Design a protein around this ligand. Structure first.
Ligand SMILES: [Cl-]
Ligand SMILES: [Mg+2]
Ligand SMILES: [Mg+2]
Lengths: 250, 243, 244, 111, 204, 241, 4, 195, 231, 225, 4
């Protein structure tokens, strides 16, 4: 036995292209549409719950994941690759930061750590790149609200708003017209729902849409009282009902 | 194409061709059989006499594992020996920790998982043997047959090698004509007959019969080789049945 | 076995070239142009962001210019992710040197180490090289202001003025024409921007498509300041030089 | 604690003539004030006209004689059945003994 | 033989109204023999001050180590580390040597740049945090410093008053310890200015 | 065309070795079904003993992973037994480390994460199996979680696997469209097994003897498989109404 | 170290 | 004070409830009877930490055994205990009595002293308080006793062990292992002291 | 063809070509004969020279006082396998005070050869061996193939033109088996057997190599004027 | 002094606020009540660093396990992970913890010693003041305590320790974990040891201390221009 | 430690 694949499976072609990274991005293109919008007082990330079977319980599959109390992630591309990246992202947030500084990492540094894991799958021996693009929304005391994209290469860029996957080119055009620097969080959610309706074919309701925000601190979701400086998580996943309420004012 | 050049590669069918090629090596080997009787199991094998210079009764093919399990195989003999060596390590480690001798179904999966492991990587070759094994445990008699893929099942009768179709037909008759079961001493006689009948597929060179058995009543649930008078009694019965 | 699928990333061509190094350099030639210009009284780093969007947050964005320590900065051309791996290595080496000798690392020593790492990926391990070219802008008290470049081969050379990435041929001709030795930082800023303005594949050169940095002794008395220009500051220096 | 060494007593004597040599030893093996055996040999033919005795801790003595005997066997294999001279045997035994320098063989060796 | 009392020395930190003060002696010795009277035990990484008592080799080593860690922090975070965060970094770094510890008594002092809240903390050699409102003491004359601070200190002292209190606390504690003295430094820390004063004291 | 031999991306962004592993899944030509009652989770699977020389008692594609978790496999038996042994090991290790019985959906996730690795690491091949995990979880109640060679998993109200899965799927879909509930509203597991068998008969259009089926039942605090005689009693009840 |  | 006794219908495990740190009673209601399988239990004596660590590993090994090979024998359980106790004898202070009910082998008792040796016995006693009841237990033990007789024998036995041993005390816990299933019995001081 | 690149690859007919190519190295090798009675076992080896200035490559290796082999194929591989036998014979003596059974020596060689036919990177052994020995069950002759197959025989031959010697032994079987307590006559039968594999060249004093082991005979090799008796 | 008391619908843990270095009081108001998870808290005695370190490590691993399983963490998980860690280090990590909490299984109270032995109870005490605390618990505990009774009993058991033990002192910290409710952390629930006003102000006249030298410290970065 |  032994892993005898100690050599790179991603190499430069004569044209200077890295084939496997390009092909990984092609996999991301086929993937379902997800988007992120940054408001003055929060960030919204959204995607479609493309259920494989109506017998399947789509609630059990989480496309929008909490990484830290103040950082959320959504993806487009291969779900399994996303799930193991979320597991690794949550752990590295602890091992490489919280266990050292006694606080959760700021958005940009956790993104930097995720990016590093995905660059390594691009150069290390006997592995293919991750077939996902991540949108990571987060808050931290000194940077405030922020939204980042991470690609299979390991490259990451900060966005005011963007979209990835199936209908990204159309979605990004729609966001460019609607986005301003004076948007409240409720305005960004409304725009997020409008943008996402264009890329969805079938049913469009709280049960088929997965949407989370990075907003105000939620003391009701902390789970304990008695420490004034602990005010609770800024990440909140919107309920099925909460989405349907905002689809009547649509 | 090229899906058959590397082990552990799925063809567009969903097949591992390297494993299917290993089966060809098995089909090429001498006939070996197993019969499950009332209170035990009987193993028999065809040994081709290539030359007069071969010392009779010396080149023993059937192998014991622990003291209660018999193993016979068709195909690449060295691959068989390698699998039994692992079987002996697995049986040793089990008895070391759990005190009781390894149950046959437990032992079957130990070989199964090991053989299957040799279909997971391109750095290894699948096993070039089908292995018929079994014996007596606390729950009674068990006969198993294990393919290069790692596939194994329990059997009333088992056969592999060049004369398997012929053997399988003779085993299917015994199952039908003995629903209440077969005795250990009967199974030894029948084993002899089935090897002699299956030798029609290797009729060019004359052969040497080799039988073993584990019976709760006849061997105290230990693996023993059939020798001397009882072996000659089985050869005589077999010779009488072909004539 | 596994030999079947090995690209063999560390072999010579019949002509005695390293395939993967050559193809990596081809990759870098498509990256946004980065320029370094060294003056008597400081160094300039100018770099072009690749076809940006109106919805890219620029003020919190960094793809081209990175800080290695208080005295040394790099301009990147190639894979940003690959560059970040090497940058963190360089940042650690600088702090290791400071811990050991209680002195800031000389620029060449840091450059040589990063260049020695790139060389390794071309001679052993069977991994792809780093698709990155660096322009190092630094100051130490031995050689003063220094410009270097490294490429995937692990070769590094010193420069008065240099370009990497896209249209280096064109950029190097323009620099070689207008550069003089007695040149000052303010002049070197003007040259850097005028060079990008003429080599750029874009219709016009604007603030939102540039990263800009200076290393000046323009710091109160005998010390060195690194200035990573803010979007509004890049917009101001574009009007001042008269490009917008 | 556990003491890895013991004393089995006995005495050995080597005398060299002009064209002969003798290696003698008593056949008594003891522990404390108990006699273990009245006839337990301590002088051994090792082949190539070499006689050896390692006297002290019997276990370490038996181990050394075994290793040297084995050393003679592999000399024959690796050097086309060359006869091992007594000077060569002596140097080989020095390396056997010094091998366990920091966990010694508690034996006095005569060949 | 006891590592934490070979070289000797003391550090004390106090909080005032919108200010903190940290002070140390200047002695380094080989037990009874005094070697150096220039051995400062207070270091600063940006606006966060760290005093370290104990084995001098470890004082120097940890200073070099925290300079290293705070330098990388600043490059990645793009901002200076705050006292609360640096306290957690010291604790982490000390406890990772749990079964082979640095023989030190660290003291963190500084003002949180955002909240403007004065902050002091002390540590044991394996990184347990003592986050006191009033004062922190460390070194061979910790008993003496505890006695002085516990009587002299009152809350909400003005910078120029706090200076006199911490100075008298150090000076009188040091004079009752053989392995402490040979000069003393006092840092008065406000939000955006820091004054450093060397004290006249008996040199024996 | 070596992008079809190992788990690297094709120009279309596909992993052919994963797709071909899915095809290996149907090699046995066996159809499995899983449904949820009020208090129980039932899993039924076709049993085919083509050889008269086989000991039919040893021919099984249902596995007791832990006391609480059961697993039915669609795929070749070697890969099935590979997955079984690993799941058994993982369930035991979990109980030792975290001091409570591994939940059905957590084991499913763990086996799916292992499956994902084989799709990303070249030296390991995907297992040619679909794993259907069933239990009565102490938190989530009756649970069905299914894993595939891609490393995908999800929860199910009910599910079906094998060559004729789509026929069984639509049959179940149509039932749940009428009842408008996520389970079989039945007190006894006996009647939930009768439902499972009845709806498979209707979907496949084949009758079953006691030796043609293989049944696994999950109740609170144990998962067990039915004997031939336990199934015969189930078949007699169906026929008598 | 410190040590309820 | 711990003992396991074989009788006609199966086996009974008995223990006191006293945990000591020196002469202080850390826990006066300790459960020293621990389940390693449905009908395989053990009594723990020696280091509380060491016996828990061992018991936790054995429970793991037998759970994994059950998944693969079905219900393990009492002999198998005893062997796994021995393997841990013998191989780690330099770092362990654990005296464990293993008791279990098969349908084939009925009631079986195995004792594992410090060495890590195994002894199959009709009944077994262990712990500090066991020394005081060697005489009593030997004189009063018969084979194929009734359940009521065996409960009385254990109650009287541990009652004496508790009386003389300072390290033993509190309630007497018992666990009955028969075909019928698993029964937990408790006897309080006011009951067993007046015996 | 496409399936002979390495030892880890089966052909579509279930053949291991790298093993079959290793088997070919033996047929190129110089002829060696093995035969035994009840009392003694004999090896006879035709040694091969490079030219008239060169020595004749040694074919027979001693493994213990009671066991040794003759080689045909890659000599270095014979050295590796003989060194392994020497160690296994040695281990049996030191640990168990027991002379290694010839049958068990065979089983050990088989298992060593097998590992090199199922693992990537390695290669099969390129040599065939004839192991003779006298143990507690009397005289023994074994034939080793680098496929792993080991066979106990009354007599055999391996190498170039080996079929000639093998046919002779197959006729003489009933005669030479009965040659008990007569070492010289058993060697004569061995020399007459190898003579059936000669063409052009005949047996000279520095050409012929003989070895014998028996009841009261340690494994000894005869070369030079020691074999002039049998020419 | 650390105590845990089970009551009708949950569990309460309490602790004193004194840390010692030899006979000297290092910290007069110190937090010995550690959050492993939102609704799993544990009190720590022994080596101060070790109790904080071992709760933070398990607290971190419990958070990752909760995220991985999509389930609220269980006390038995924290308990198992703590005991296996402490056992590995053969008592060299001197952590003596009372682990309490509510989870989907119900309310739980456990103690765990430094060598990795665990026990179950309705009332537990650990630390130097354990015997003072246990005396009060053994005297006043009953089955079916209310919340108000359990807090009273818990803080009474700590007070016993504070007064009668030189190792325990200062204030009483409480944490109440009730089923189907947010755990309430009552920091300084009681303040029985408030220091009396001093007779004199020791505030010195400015210029009392003799100064050799004065200087500005540069805390700012290298400046522009 | 705790130790019948
Ligand atoms: Cl995982
Ligand atoms: Mg793969
Ligand atoms: Mg008592």
């Amino acid at each position: 036995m032994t892993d005898r694949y100690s050599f790179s499976l991603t190499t430069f072609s004569p044209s200077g292209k890295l084939g496997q990274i390009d092909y990984a991005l092609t996999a991301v293109k086929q993937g379902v549409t997800s988007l992120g919008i940054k408001a003055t007082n929060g960030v919204v990330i959204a995607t479609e719950k493309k259920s494989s079977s109506p017998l399947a319980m789509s609630e059990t599959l989480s496309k929008v994941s909490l990484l830290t109390p103040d950082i959320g992630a959504v993806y487009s591309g291969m779900g399994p690759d996303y799930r193991v990246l979320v597991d690794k992202s949550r752990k590295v947030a602890h091992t490489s930061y919280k266990r050292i500084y006694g606080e959760y990492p700021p958005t940009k540094l956790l993104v930097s750590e995720v990016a590093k894991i995905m660059q390594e799958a691009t150069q290390s021996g006997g592995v293919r790149p991750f077939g996902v693009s991540l949108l990571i929304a987060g808050h931290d005391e000194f940077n405030g609200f922020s939204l980042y994209q991470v690609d299979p290469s390991g490259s990451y860029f900060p966005w005011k708003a963007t979209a990835i996957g199936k209908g990204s080119v159309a979605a990004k055009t729609f966001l460019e017209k609607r986005w301003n620097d004076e948007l409240e969080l409720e305005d960004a959610i409304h725009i997020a729902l409008l943008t996402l309706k264009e890329s969805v074919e079938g049913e469009f309701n709280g049960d088929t849409i997965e949407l989370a925000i990075i907003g105000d601190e939620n003391p009701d979701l902390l789970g304990y009282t008695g420490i004034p400086t602990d005010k609770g998580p800024r990440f909140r996943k919107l309920t099925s009902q909460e989405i349907n309420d905002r689809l009547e004012a649509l | 194409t090229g899906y058959d050049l590397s082990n552990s590669v799925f063809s567009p069918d969903g097949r591992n061709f390297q494993v299917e090629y290993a089966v060809k090596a098995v089909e090429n080997g001498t006939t070996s059989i197993g019969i499950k009787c009332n209170d035990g199991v009987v193993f028999a094998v065809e040994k081709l006499i290539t030359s007069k210079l071969l010392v009779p009764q010396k080149n023993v093919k059937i192998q014991v594992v622990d003291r209660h399990i018999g193993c016979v195989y068709s195909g690449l003999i060295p691959d068989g020996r390698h699998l039994v060596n692992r079987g002996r390590e697995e049986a040793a480690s089990f008895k070391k920790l759990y005190k009781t001798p390894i149950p046959i179904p437990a032992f079957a999966d130990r070989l199964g998982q090991y053989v299957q492991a040799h279909t997971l990587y391109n750095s290894v070759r699948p096993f070039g043997v089908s292995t018929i094994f079994g014996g007596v445990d606390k729950n009674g008699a068990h006969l198993y047959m294990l393919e290069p893929s790692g596939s194994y099942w329990g059997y009333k009768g088992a056969a592999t090698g060049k004369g398997r179709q012929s053997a399988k037909a003779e085993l299917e008759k015994l199952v039908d004509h003995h629903p209440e079961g077969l005795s250990a001493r009967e199974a030894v006689k029948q084993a002899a007959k089935i090897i002699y009948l299956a030798h029609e597929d290797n009729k060019e060179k004359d052969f040497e019969l080799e039988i073993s058995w584990c019976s709760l009543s006849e061997t105290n649930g230990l693996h023993k080789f059939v020798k001397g008078d009882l072996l000659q009694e089985a050869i005589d019965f077999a010779q009488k049945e072909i004539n | 076995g596994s030999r079947r699928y090995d690209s063999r990333t560390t072999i010579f061509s019949p002509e005695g070239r390293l395939y993967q190094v050559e193809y990596a350099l081809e990759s870098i030639s498509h990256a946004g142009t980065a320029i370094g210009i060294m003056a008597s009284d400081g160094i300039v780093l100018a770099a072009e962001r690749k076809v940006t969007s109106t919805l890219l947050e620029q003020d919190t964005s960094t793809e081209k210019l990175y800080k290695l320590n208080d005295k040394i900065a790099v301009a990147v051309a190639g894979l940003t992710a690959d560059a970040e791996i090497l940058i963190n290595t360089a940042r650690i080496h600088a702090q290791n040197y400071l811990k050991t000798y209680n002195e800031d690392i000389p620029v060449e020593i840091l450059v040589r180490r990063l260049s020695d790492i790139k060389q390794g990926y071309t001679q052993h391990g069977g991994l792809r090289p780093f698709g990155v070219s660096f322009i190092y802008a630094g100051y130490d008290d031995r050689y003063g202001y220094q410009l270097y470049t490294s490429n995937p081969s692990g070769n590094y050379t010193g420069w008065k003025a240099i370009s990497v990435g896209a249209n280096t041929s064109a950029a190097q001709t323009l620099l070689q024409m207008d550069y003089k030795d007695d040149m000052k930082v303010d002049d070197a800023i003007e040259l850097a921007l005028k060079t990008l303005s003429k080599t750029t594949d874009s219709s016009a050169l604007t603030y939102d498509r540039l990263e800009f940095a200076t290393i000046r002794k323009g710091a109160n008395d005998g010390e060195v300041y690194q200035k990573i220009f803010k979007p509004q500051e890049i917009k101001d220096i574009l009007v001042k030089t008269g490009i917008t | 604690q556990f003491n890895p060494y013991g004393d089995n007593g006995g005495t050995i004597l080597g005398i060299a003539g002009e064209d002969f040599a003798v290696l003698a030893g008593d056949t008594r093996n003891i522990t404390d004030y108990s006699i273990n055996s009245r006839y337990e040999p301590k002088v051994f033919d090792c082949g190539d006209n070499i006689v050896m005795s390692a006297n002290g801790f019997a276990a370490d003595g038996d181990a050394l004689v075994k290793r040297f005997k084995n050393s003679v066997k592999w000399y024959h294999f690796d050097h086309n059945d060359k006869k091992l001279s007594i000077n060569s045997a002596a140097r080989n035994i020095q390396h056997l003994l010094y091998g366990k320098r920091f966990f010694p063989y508690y034996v006095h060796t005569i060949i | 033989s006891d590592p934490s009392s070979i070289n000797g020395g003391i550090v004390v930190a106090m909080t005032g109204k919108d200010c903190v003060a940290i002070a140390c002696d200047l002695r380094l010795g080989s037990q009874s023999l005094g070697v150096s009277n220039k051995f400062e035990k207070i270091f600063h990484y940006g606006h966060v001050f760290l005093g370290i008592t104990g084995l001098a080799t470890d004082v120097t080593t940890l200073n070099e180590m925290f300079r290293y860690k705070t330098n990388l922090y600043k490059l990645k975070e793009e901002r200076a580390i705050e006292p609360e965060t640096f306290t957690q970094l010291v604790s982490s770094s000390l406890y990772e040597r749990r079964f082979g510890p640095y023989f030190v008594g660290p003291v963190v002092a500084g003002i949180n740049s955002k909240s403007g809240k004065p902050f002091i903390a002390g540590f044991d050699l394996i990184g347990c945090i003592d986050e006191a409102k009033d004062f922190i003491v460390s070194g061979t004359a910790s008993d003496q410093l505890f006695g002085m601070c516990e009587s002299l200190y009152e809350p909400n002292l003005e910078p120029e008053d706090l200076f006199e209190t911490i100075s008298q606390a150090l000076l009188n504690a040091a004079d009752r310890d053989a392995l402490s003295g040979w000069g003393a430094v006092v840092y008065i820390i406000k939000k955006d200015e820091v004054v450093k004063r060397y004290l006249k004291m008996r040199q024996d | 065309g070596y992008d079809r031999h190992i788990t690297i991306f094709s120009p279309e962004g596909r992993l052919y070795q994963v797709e071909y592993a899915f095809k290996a899944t149907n090699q046995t030509n066996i159809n499995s079904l899983a449904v949820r009652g009020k208090d129980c989770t039932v899993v039924i699977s076709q049993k085919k003993v083509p050889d008269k020389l086989l000991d039919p008692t040893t021919v099984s594609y249902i596995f007791c992973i832990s006391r609480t978790i059961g697993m039915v496999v669609n795929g070749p038996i070697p890969d099935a037994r590979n997955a079984a042994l690993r799941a058994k090991a993982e369930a035991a290790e979990f109980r030792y480390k975290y001091g409570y019985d591994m939940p059905c959906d957590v084991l499913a996730k763990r086996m799916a994460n292992l499956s994902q690795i084989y799709t990303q690491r070249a030296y390991m091949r995907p297992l040619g199996v679909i794993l259907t995990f069933v239990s009565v979880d102490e938190e989530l109640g009756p649970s069905i979680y299914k894993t595939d060679p891609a490393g995908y998993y999800v929860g199910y109200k009910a599910t079906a696997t094998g060559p004729k899965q789509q026929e069984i799927t639509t049959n179940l879909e149509n039932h749940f469209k009428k009842s408008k509930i996520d389970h079989i509203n039945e007190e006894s597991w006996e009647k939930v097994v009768e439902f499972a068998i009845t709806h498979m008969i209707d979907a496949l259009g084949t009758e079953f003897s006691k030796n043609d089926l293989e049944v696994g039942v999950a109740t609170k605090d144990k998962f067990f498989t039915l004997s031939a005689e336990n199934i015969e009693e189930r078949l007699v009840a169906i026929a008598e109404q | 170290x410190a040590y309820x | 004070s711990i003992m396991a006794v074989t009788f006609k219908d199966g086996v009974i495990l008995g223990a006191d409830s006293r945990t000591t740190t020196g002469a202080y009673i850390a826990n006066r209601v300790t459960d020293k009877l621990t389940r390693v399988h449905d009908k395989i239990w053990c009594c723990r004596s020696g280091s509380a930490a060491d016996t828990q660590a061992i018991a936790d590993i054995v429970q793991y090994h037998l759970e994994l055994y059950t998944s693969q090979y079905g219900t393990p024998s009492t002999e198998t359980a005893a062997s796994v205990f021995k393997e841990l106790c013998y191989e780690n004898k330099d770092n362990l202070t654990a005296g464990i009595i293993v008791a279990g009910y098969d349908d084939k082998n009925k009631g079986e008792v195995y004792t594992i002293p410090l060495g890590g040796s195994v002894h199959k016995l009709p009944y077994a006693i262990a712990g500090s308080g066991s020394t005081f009841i060697y005489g009593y237990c030997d004189k009063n033990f018969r084979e194929n006793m009734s359940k009521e007789e065996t409960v009385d024998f254990i109650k009287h036995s541990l009652s004496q062990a508790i009386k003389w041993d300072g390290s033993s005390g509190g309630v007497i816990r018992m666990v009955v292992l028969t075909a019928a299933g698993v029964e937990r019995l408790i006897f309080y001081p006011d009951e067993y002291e007046q015996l | 063809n496409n399936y002979d690149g390495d030892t880890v690859t089966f052909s579509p007919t279930g053949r291991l070509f790298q093993v079959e190519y290793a088997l070919e190295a033996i047929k190129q090798g110089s002829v060696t004969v093995g035969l035994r009675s009840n009392t003694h076992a004999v090896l006879v080896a035709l040694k091969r020279n490079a030219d008239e200035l060169s020595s004749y490559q040694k074919k027979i290796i001693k493994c213990d006082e009671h066991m040794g082999l003759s080689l045909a194929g890659l000599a270095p591989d014979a050295r590796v396998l003989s060194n392994y036998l020497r160690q296994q014979c040695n281990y049996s003596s030191l640990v168990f005070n027991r002379k290694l059974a010839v049958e068990r020596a065979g089983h050990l060689l088989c298992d060593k050869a097998q590992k090199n036919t199922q693992s990537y990177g390695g290669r099969p052994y390129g040599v065939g061996l004839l192991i003779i020995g006298y143990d507690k069950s009397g005289a023994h002759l074994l034939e080793f193939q680098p496929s792993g197959n080991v066979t106990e025989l009354y007599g055999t031959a391996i190498g170039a033109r080996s079929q000639g010697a093998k046919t002779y032994l197959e006729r003489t079987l009933d005669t030479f088996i009965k040659i008990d307590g007569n070492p010289d006559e058993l060697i004569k039968a061995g020399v007459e057997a190898i003579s059936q594999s000669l063409r052009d060249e005949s047996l000279t004093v520095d050409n012929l190599s003989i070895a014998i082991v028996g009841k009261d005979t340690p494994f000894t090799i005869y070369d030079g004027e020691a074999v002039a008796k049998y020419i | 002094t650390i105590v845990g008391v089970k009551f009708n619908n949950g569990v309460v843990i309490a602790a004193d606020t004194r840390s010692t270095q030899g006979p000297i009081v290092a910290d007069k108001n110190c937090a010995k009540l550690h959050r492993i998870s939102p609704k799993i808290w544990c009190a720590g005695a022994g080596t101060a660093a070790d109790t904080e370190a071992v709760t933070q490590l398990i607290g971190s691993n419990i958070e990752l396990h909760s995220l991985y399983t999509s389930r609220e963490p269980r006390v038995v998980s924290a308990l198992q992970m703590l005991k296996q860690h402490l056992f590995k280090y053969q008592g060299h990590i001197g952590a003596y913890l009372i682990v309490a909490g509510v989870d989907p299984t119900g309310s739980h109270l456990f103690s765990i010693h430094a060598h990795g032995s665990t026990d179950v109870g309705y009332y537990l005490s650990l630390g130097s003041g354990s015997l003072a605390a246990m005396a009060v618990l053994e005297s006043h505990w009953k089955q079916d305590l209310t919340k108000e009774e359990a807090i009273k009993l818990a803080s009474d058991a700590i007070q016993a320790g504070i007064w009668n033990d030189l190792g325990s002192g200062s204030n009483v910290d409480v944490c109440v974990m009730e089923i189907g409710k947010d755990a309430e952390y009552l920091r300084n629930y009681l303040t029985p040891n408030v220091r009396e006003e001093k007779q004199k102000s020791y505030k010195f006249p400015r210029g009392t201390t003799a100064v050799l030298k004065e200087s500005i410290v540069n805390i700012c970065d290298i400046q522009e221009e």
